[PDB]
Nucleic acid binder design. Sequence first.
RNA 1: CCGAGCCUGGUGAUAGCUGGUUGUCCAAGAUAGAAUCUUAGUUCAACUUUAAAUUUGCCCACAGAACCAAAUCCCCUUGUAAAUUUAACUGUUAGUCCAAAGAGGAACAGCUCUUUGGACACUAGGAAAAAACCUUGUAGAGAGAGUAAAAAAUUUAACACCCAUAGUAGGCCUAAAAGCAGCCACCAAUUAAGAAAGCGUUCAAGCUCAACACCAAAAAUCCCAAACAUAUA
RNA 2: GUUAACCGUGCAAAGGUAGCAUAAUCACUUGUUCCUUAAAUAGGGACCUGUAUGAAUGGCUCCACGAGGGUUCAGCUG
RNA 3: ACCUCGGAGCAGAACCCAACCUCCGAGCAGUACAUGCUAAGACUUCACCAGUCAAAGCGAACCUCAAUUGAUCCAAUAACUUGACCAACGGAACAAGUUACCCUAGGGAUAACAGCGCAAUCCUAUUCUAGAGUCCAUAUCAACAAUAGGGUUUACGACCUCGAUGUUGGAUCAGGACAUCCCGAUGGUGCAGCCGCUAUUAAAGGUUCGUUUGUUCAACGAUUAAAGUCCUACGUGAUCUGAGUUCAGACCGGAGUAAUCCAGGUCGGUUUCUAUCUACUUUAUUCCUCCCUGUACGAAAGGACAAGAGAAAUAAGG
RNA 4: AGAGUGUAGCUUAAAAGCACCCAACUUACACUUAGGAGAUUCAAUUGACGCUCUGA
Lengths: 111, 205, 131, 64, 120
Amino acid sequence: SSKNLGGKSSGRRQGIKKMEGHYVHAGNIIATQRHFRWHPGAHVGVGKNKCLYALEEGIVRYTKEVYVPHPRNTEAVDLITRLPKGAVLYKTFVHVVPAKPEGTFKLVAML
Amino acid sequence: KPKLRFIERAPLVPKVRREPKNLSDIRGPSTEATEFTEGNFAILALGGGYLHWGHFEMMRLTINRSMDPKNMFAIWRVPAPFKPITRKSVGHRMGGGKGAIDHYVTPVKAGRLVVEMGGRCEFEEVQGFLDQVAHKLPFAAKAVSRGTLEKMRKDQEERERNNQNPWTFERIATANMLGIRKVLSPYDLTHKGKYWGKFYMPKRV
Amino acid sequence: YKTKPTHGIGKYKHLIKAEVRAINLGTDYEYGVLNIHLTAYDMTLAESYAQYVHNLCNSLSIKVEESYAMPTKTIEVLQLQMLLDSVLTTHERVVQISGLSATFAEIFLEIIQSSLPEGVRLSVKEHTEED
Amino acid sequence: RRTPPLGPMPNSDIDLSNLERLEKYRSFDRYRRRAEQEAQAPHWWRTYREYFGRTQQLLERKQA
Amino acid sequence: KFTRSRIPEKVFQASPEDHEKYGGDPQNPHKLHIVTRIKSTRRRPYWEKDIIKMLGLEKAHTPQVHKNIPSVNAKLKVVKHLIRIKPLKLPQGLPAEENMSNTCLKSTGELVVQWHLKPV
RNA sequence: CCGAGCCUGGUGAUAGCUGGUUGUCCAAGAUAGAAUCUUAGUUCAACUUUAAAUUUGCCCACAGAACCAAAUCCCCUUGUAAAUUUAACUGUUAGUCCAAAGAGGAACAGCUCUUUGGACACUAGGAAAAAACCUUGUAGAGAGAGUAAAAAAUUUAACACCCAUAGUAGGCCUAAAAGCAGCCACCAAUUAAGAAAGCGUUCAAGCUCAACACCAAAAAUCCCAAACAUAUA
RNA sequence: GUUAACCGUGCAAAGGUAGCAUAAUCACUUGUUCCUUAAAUAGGGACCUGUAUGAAUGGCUCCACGAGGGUUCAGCUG
RNA sequence: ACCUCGGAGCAGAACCCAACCUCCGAGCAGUACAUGCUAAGACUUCACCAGUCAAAGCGAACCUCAAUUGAUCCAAUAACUUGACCAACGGAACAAGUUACCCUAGGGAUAACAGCGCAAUCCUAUUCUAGAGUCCAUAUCAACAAUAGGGUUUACGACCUCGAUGUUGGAUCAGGACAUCCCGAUGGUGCAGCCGCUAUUAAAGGUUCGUUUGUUCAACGAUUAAAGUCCUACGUGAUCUGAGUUCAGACCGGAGUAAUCCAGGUCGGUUUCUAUCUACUUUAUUCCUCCCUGUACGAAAGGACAAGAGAAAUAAGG
RNA sequence: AGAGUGUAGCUUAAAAGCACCCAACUUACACUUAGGAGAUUCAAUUGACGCUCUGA
Ligand SMILES: [Mg+2]
Ligand SMILES: [Mg+2]
Ligand SMILES: [Mg+2]
Ligand SMILES: [Mg+2]
Ligand SMILES: [Mg+2]
Ligand SMILES: [Mg+2]
Ligand SMILES: [Mg+2]
Ligand SMILES: [Mg+2]
Ligand SMILES: [Mg+2]
Ligand SMILES: [Mg+2]
Ligand SMILES: [Mg+2]
Ligand SMILES: [Mg+2]
Ligand SMILES: [Mg+2]
Ligand SMILES: [Mg+2]
Ligand SMILES: [Mg+2]
Ligand SMILES: [Mg+2]
Ligand SMILES: [Mg+2]
Ligand SMILES: [Mg+2]
Ligand SMILES: [Mg+2]
Ligand SMILES: [Mg+2]
Ligand SMILES: [Mg+2]
Ligand SMILES: [Mg+2]
Ligand SMILES: [Mg+2]
Ligand SMILES: [Mg+2]
Ligand SMILES: [Mg+2]
Ligand SMILES: [Mg+2]
Ligand SMILES: [Mg+2]
Ligand SMILES: [Mg+2]
Ligand SMILES: [Mg+2]
């Protein structure tokens, strides 16, 4: 008969959309997941899904940085407290090294 | 207590999750108990295979019968049976889910030492019944002292070194000389020529 | 990534342990969970003493697993001569201590003795109790 | 594949067999400080920095 | 699963013995390969076939020239069992404009800019 | 020829089902998945064909893709020649074996189900015959040439000759247990012979041994090429 | 509970009565026993957990009759 | 049994990935009431549909949660909005049994018969010596297990055949294997003799008649030297039977409201073919009797081989 | 009598940073907030007082 029934769910198609070095315009989704596999860094936002999106035009970069959580989020704090006195956690981040300058001064007129 | 203790069939706390039959616990050489631990003689398993409770019982009994308990002792080097095995009822059509659990079995790999022996004795005294045990067992097995084992290893090493055949298996594999990886397994880089399935060709190199 | 050289830089769970006998071996020794029962008549005093003990333990790199308090026993006594009542109370406060190597324990005991407050009594014994 | 690390990994020296003898950051502040220090150090794995970035007098003072 | 075989680079390192066996020297290495195909692209993976095509080795036994340089070498490695790689070596000077027409590839890999049909 | 007559008409009824579908020649061309009263079908996708516009497309190297094996993605060079879009369509959308990673089943199936790669459903040569193993593909004529894969090897168990007296029928235990039912002890005389290692004794007795001396096959019509150890790779 | 008259207890509209019974009657089933045969998974007669018998769904006897289906003495006959 | 949705494994490192594979769960709840309005740029459950995320801006402050859901048209509604366990969950606005009285179109894409594969089950032989066998593992039997082989059974699979490969038994005729039931020739024996048990070798010859029974089987009676095991499309229906069994009639029990049904029982129930081709159509065993003999052997009970003579029986040929 | 030297507990600090102490939250610890205390042993890289170590 088969006692087990139910798990016929498809794959979520999650993962990295933009790998390191890829040029990225503002608003594009860099990477999608459940549970922070990758974290947001410079010029990278977060949705409600934990999906990372780019906040500026330029090159995506991945980097191992030091994890220091917000003091109001409690679990992380607890974990930190638990750790021995020389250790630091480390975590993988996604930055967007911005390409163009925010703007340039151009000549309007000679008054 | 110098005597093989009772290895009861199944654990006392059984497991409701049915495992899939991964045969990779048979395939290849044993990562686990290759070397000794305070026992001069042993039964070396020269091949992979699952040990039923019956086999265990046999091992226990024969040794006990032909043991000199004051002068010698014995140890299990294999756990009690723990991998469950589902058999379906007699003569069912295919499908309708996975079958119910029947019996439990320890996987042994080649290179494992199954039973260990020690005490005031030579290997010549212990050979007789250990050989019998080996014969009884469900794989290539060999009654093996420490010294004997060492000798065997040395011989193997020599073979590896000596051979005038320029073409080893390893060389052909890793370099991918004939695109031969289209034939070979991905495990045939670590195992090399020596291991095929549960079988371990000890001569070849 | 796994194939990268940086693999497992985020690994933290081996730095945390998220999961009793008296081991007296041969040259390395351990007393098993010693309960220091601080019995006294003043509520404050016993507490103070307990606190001090705890502090000492902390200083000395010794674990303090439990530091509970036991209930106050109302020993109601009739002062016989004209019945004059005197409802006294005895307060027991505990500080459990695990690991302790040969030389340390004696020293600790000595320290405790030195520090003993005015009208307070000790009892150092094993954990096997029913609260 | 399983390449070895280029230089020394972080959190390698401190672990040991006995975790429960060690001091631990009972606070947040200490941890934060440590993190900052780590950040300040160079490392070998790329990072944010890679891509973006008398006696008499004393005596007198004391007297004062 | 059959896979796209990654080959370690201890395989591609010439020993002194190897050198002795074959012709070449480690200093002053050959510039150019003659790369001949000696095996079919059938009964093989598509990638290999593609590589072969790229190399210009559709015809067997019909040699092509190539540069002895990393990218090309990598490609060759992908299909090295399908092929015979031998160094192009020029005893006489390499072709000018007057010679061009008169050339001959030969066995033993040599271009030979004087090609007469007369004996010595 | 009645589960509801026969005839004519509606009726060229309707058939996701079967059968059939006619001159020549050339060219490109093989099966990810989706829903579905749907799994004998179909619409979309995917692959495929044509005509267009194009600018990159394959192959890729450092760097990079997480905490609780084999590889892959990404990817400049380089070797190459195409891929993407636009316009127009049909047809495939009931597959097989082989290698490899697995799952179900008996670590059964020419079994079933996924993935990765072959091959076949396209010619040829081999593996006896042979779809799926190997060698090999772009074509035609030649009474030319060099090659590729490509022919299965093995034959097996002799083994010792001699010589054995004693404290002692050790104690203990046992109706009796004598080297040998079970324990403790295992000392000791002569060159040399265990407080006995096989049998054997109801207990004894006799036989040895240790020691001196001496030096792989069995099934059903009829075995299945014929045959061959010797002139130079 | 005492093979049970009997007792205790529940549910029901009533609780299968007379009869007949291994039947042309789920299975167990070659049920058990007497006759029949040298020999009987057949036939006849008895016994009765038929747990799925049974009363105009007709129950049970019985005279005649039946190309109905079984068994059989004798005679006979390729 | 399942049918929609979600998490983990199979699927170990970008996506993707199955089974009537293994395991957990969902068909909400809580907090808000700017859960306002707009809008660059992306992801996407391999299509579409559905889903996801979101910079800036305007307007205001100073969402949690893994799944927690349902198209169109229709309804209800002044309007905003709200309607399904349409759970067969991409949903037909609303429909059920049965057919052996059946029919049609197909299918060897899919079963029963047979073959073929495989060999779990089944049978056989070795290995191993625990244990039985007053003692003694191997006269004989034999546990745990090991290594082979077979293709008698029950299955499993679905590769040939559904523009038909016709079935259970029996008759007829038998070809074959040997894993020998008898007949021969040996070895061992817990073989004195007679009987035996066991192993080697042997397939020239043979392997009964009845009661019951649709039956192979099975039981029983009488014998016999013996009344072998199997294969051959469960040998053999263009040679036969058709008692069973696969139809239309009918009863008993039961199931069902009923039509009707039952891997229940029972009475009844048409078996067609002139041979085109291949193939083919005259090559001694055994039992008993008499003696040997009431001898060998055995303490007695009992009781032989061989050698010889005579009678039969079947089979083959007249 | 000789050797090593010599920043408060400690330091590839140069008057630092960690250790430390009292309160208030705390059962207590821990955290946190308020406070608290501290040092170049002394004379021009040299010498003379302080320890540690080895002798008598
Ligand atoms: Mg899943
Ligand atoms: Mg799926
Ligand atoms: Mg029509
Ligand atoms: Mg259809
Ligand atoms: Mg073509
Ligand atoms: Mg529908
Ligand atoms: Mg198949
Ligand atoms: Mg199939
Ligand atoms: Mg050609
Ligand atoms: Mg003797
Ligand atoms: Mg009945
Ligand atoms: Mg009759
Ligand atoms: Mg009539
Ligand atoms: Mg999409
Ligand atoms: Mg905004
Ligand atoms: Mg539906
Ligand atoms: Mg649906
Ligand atoms: Mg009928
Ligand atoms: Mg029909
Ligand atoms: Mg078929
Ligand atoms: Mg069949
Ligand atoms: Mg015995
Ligand atoms: Mg058919
Ligand atoms: Mg036909
Ligand atoms: Mg025979
Ligand atoms: Mg037949
Ligand atoms: Mg016929
Ligand atoms: Mg009739
Ligand atoms: Mg006929």
